[model samples]
Target: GEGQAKNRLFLGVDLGTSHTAVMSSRGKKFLLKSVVGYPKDVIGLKLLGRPYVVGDEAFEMRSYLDIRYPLQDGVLSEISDRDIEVARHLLTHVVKSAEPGPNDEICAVIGVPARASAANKALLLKMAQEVVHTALVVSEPFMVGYGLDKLINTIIVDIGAGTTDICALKGTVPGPEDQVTLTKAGNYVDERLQNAILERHPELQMNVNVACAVKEQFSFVGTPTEVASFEFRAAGKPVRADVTEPVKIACEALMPDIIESIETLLRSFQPEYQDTVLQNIVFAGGGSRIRGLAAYVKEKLRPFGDANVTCVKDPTFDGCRGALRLAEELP
Candidate 1:
């Protein structure tokens, strides 16, 4: 029943909580933060009177508009109509990135976070169906493995903005039990950093934006690498603060449970394949920027075997690249 339609352009998408990205069969790739905004007042509406702005523009206008995020805690939040609409805007903007031809048959594979409930997956697929001819939902971590060709005897850890996703790659589709999502990831780092800084210096005014910058710039674990410090305004004057200790502590807090999850998945593999599996561990997502993360994780799993852990060269593109691979292999 398969026909020449197989050669038509296709798109692969990684629908992430912090950002959404797309890769086309024709060598096009694009990414944008997963944000949408609505005008805040009549003046604002009249100036850019639109129901919504998608991606970076929407994010940049957040100071004057009501901002909405489609994905929170690594899943679609339908807590309100605006939440649902944000999801729609994110998906719509992702599709637009592909620049589909008028006659093209747009079939897409979307990577969603692991352990997304059946209801969540169905709702997402239902929403996607509105924008594309054919759509398939796959686990986010599995997509990273697929992108890297680490299908067999591998473990994938995707440390994203809102959560960390772990998947055991057994050379096939990972069933629900094979994957787990933890809520402590980048967002947690920001939260802890914000509080820790406030506690240490009550006179300084800090916000999430400043906290996230601190986390991104100095986040590391395992050992001290020099001393990370930042200049913050205190009493309307610049002050230097050495935040290395707190940054390491907050970022490292995400690793213990990640190791535990890997240990759990290690036992689930057939004993014969367990050794091979232990040698293959991968980290993905923007939060994988921490220095020495691989060495740290390798140390955590050393007892199991000679652990070979690595971070994807392009964390942002790995999942979308995996989606592109899926599209390429389709008949």
Candidate 2:
């Protein structure tokens, strides 16, 4: 009998704050909620059988489960030893979801935050070592640009839940100075929306998730053409509240810094290339999915000389797809 050659299964991983996605060279892609849930009581434990649950099942079974998120600010949340262990669980689940074969060698490229600290990157790498044979960690925005084949003079603004990362891809691996990460991103918008709505309706039962869901459903930056009404139960009665103003304000709050970041990154290039970068501006990630966001950004950037802006065709899988592309092409 002849010994078989180890099949190489390359994977691209997008470890996001809200969710994580993985794409395997085996022609499969997997998505998971960035949450791990543990049973809160003996009854819950009996129901689950396992010590913890992962992904959407965790979210669905959250009622009697103690939930812990493993990432904060788009990197591993080194809050406690248990958090790291939970992060390990998350990444293990991530790799296992790819369904590698018994003889497969797993090589992966992971997209982390643009400004992920050395310690955080090291920790993520340490976790990967347990589940993958070879792994590389890179900036999230860089992966977006690489996936789009815009590694030349271009700007990628990735508006994620915890951070909005901006990178200027200058036909080379971007250094620290070439990237910017802003904390006032999608989650910040949710917080602001919650406050604004609660301030208006003190009696309404409100939480961050409620605000975020409402924003996702009707979020926009430009003037609202229709009243964004959403249902809520108040005074023990179902009521639809007009939240257009709050949604607009919440989403718009994330734009000024994005514009400022783009302005700064564009100027970092040569004068001639600055124009190209401006015109080649691209937005990716979940927040970019806001309705009319590209036009709003383009309008704000008009003073910079006929600037053009566009969002990625696929927000959920673009980062992982980019990571996959890099992993496959890496020698």
CA lDDT, candidate 2, residue 69 = 77
Candidate 2, residues 1-331, lDDT tens digits: the string is 2323348889999987778888989888989898899989888889889888998999897887998777765554344567778888888888888898888889999987676677887878887877798999887877888898888889988887877888889988676678888898888999999998998878788999999999989999898878889998788898889999999999999999999999888888989777788878999988889999989999999878788898999999988999999999987
46-145: candidate 1 lDDT, tens digit per residue: 8886777888898887898888876776464443455656787788777877887776778899987676666777878888888887888887877888
- Highest-scoring model, lDDT: 2
lDDT of 2 at 141: 77
Per-residue error at 205 for model 1, in Å?
A: 3.4
* Candidate 1 lDDT for residue 248: 81
Predicted structure 2, TM vs. truth: 0.87
Best by TM-score: 1
Q: Model 2 segments beyond 4 Å from truth?
A: 1-6, 38-47, 62-66, 74-84, 198-205
Candidate 1: 10-residue stretch with minimal lDDT: 73-82
Q: How well does each candidate superpose onto the true structure, as a TM-score? A: 0.88, 0.87
Backbone clash pairs in model 2 (N, Cα, C under 3 Å; residues 3+ apart or in different chains), count: 0
